[PDB]
């Protein structure tokens, strides 16, 4: 039951949102019709290396649908300070700058 990565283009459906304890939920839609596939998602501080920071909490996010523009929700645990949410792979990956306060725990 292991799916390949979703390699088509993602689009944020709304601005990512901070939860009570300082994680971030991220809703995206997927242009591909090649589901089922796994949504690539991470936090990074350096877009030129993509070294992961924080944690992906929804660690098996599966698009099951093959209709275009289907929607999926992710949750990540950002590091304190500034970072980027990174969804998708390749040249069409999308990023969103994020700031987590030291007090938001």
């Amino acid at each position, epitope marked *: 039951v292991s799916y390949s990565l979703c390699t088509a283009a993602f689009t944020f459906t709304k601005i990512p949102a901070e939860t009570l304890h300082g994680t971030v939920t991220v809703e995206v839609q997927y242009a591909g019709t090649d589901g089922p596939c796994k949504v690539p998602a991470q936090m990074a501080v350096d877009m*030129q*290396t993509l070294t*992961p920071v924080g944690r992906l909490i929804t660690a098996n996010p599966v698009i099951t649908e093959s209709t275009e523009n289907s929607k999926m929700m992710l949750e990540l645990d950002p590091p304190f300070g500034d970072s980027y949410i990174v969804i998708g792979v390749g040249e069409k990956k999308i990023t969103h700058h994020w700031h987590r306060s030291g007090s938001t725990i």
Partner: antibody
Amino acid sequence: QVQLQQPGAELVKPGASVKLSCKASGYTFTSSWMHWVKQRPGQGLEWIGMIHPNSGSTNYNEKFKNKATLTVDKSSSTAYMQLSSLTSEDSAVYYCARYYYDYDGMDYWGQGTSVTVSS
Amino acid sequence: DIVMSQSPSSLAVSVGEKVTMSCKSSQSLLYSSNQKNYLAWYQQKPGQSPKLLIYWASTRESGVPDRFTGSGSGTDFTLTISSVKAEDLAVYYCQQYYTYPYTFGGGTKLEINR
């Protein structure tokens, strides 16, 4: 063309401090993290840390978090590394490096400053 | 910190030989979220700064000849030079960038028998 200009040498007394400079050109200085790496003569490579010139954010190897301080001057496209309490094992070449792991830009390491710890 | 181990520490090869160098990590460098291996290879010729050869375990830096190939996944990686040239005299380092701090292997020094 990416260029990272570093002074050739610094002579430093045992236990003293030195400030190294790295002047960047040929790419957008503020939008690339600047990394620093240590290499003792005849030995391997040790990653010191990195700084983001636009924000000033830093990420240090804990081994270097007390003895190294990274700063930048955006107006002169210059990155700086101050190293303190130099030991005889800190006689080494210190590189600044624009790490770039993507198709549309060049990774580039400067020529390094040779730091000699001696009285 | 991730521990990177390279073997052999030195190797003696002839011009035209296909040379393979190994790099092992203490935990997987394959990030399941994007299926990328966070492993780079550097070349350092005598008296020069390191130069990036390979990133993502197998992607060549621009301008690097295709005689250099990176392979492997997870904890086990190799750099291959398909037919060694005299100019390839150098120390080769692998470096994980899966976690900060970045860490390097101890290098493989390539010496040339002639």
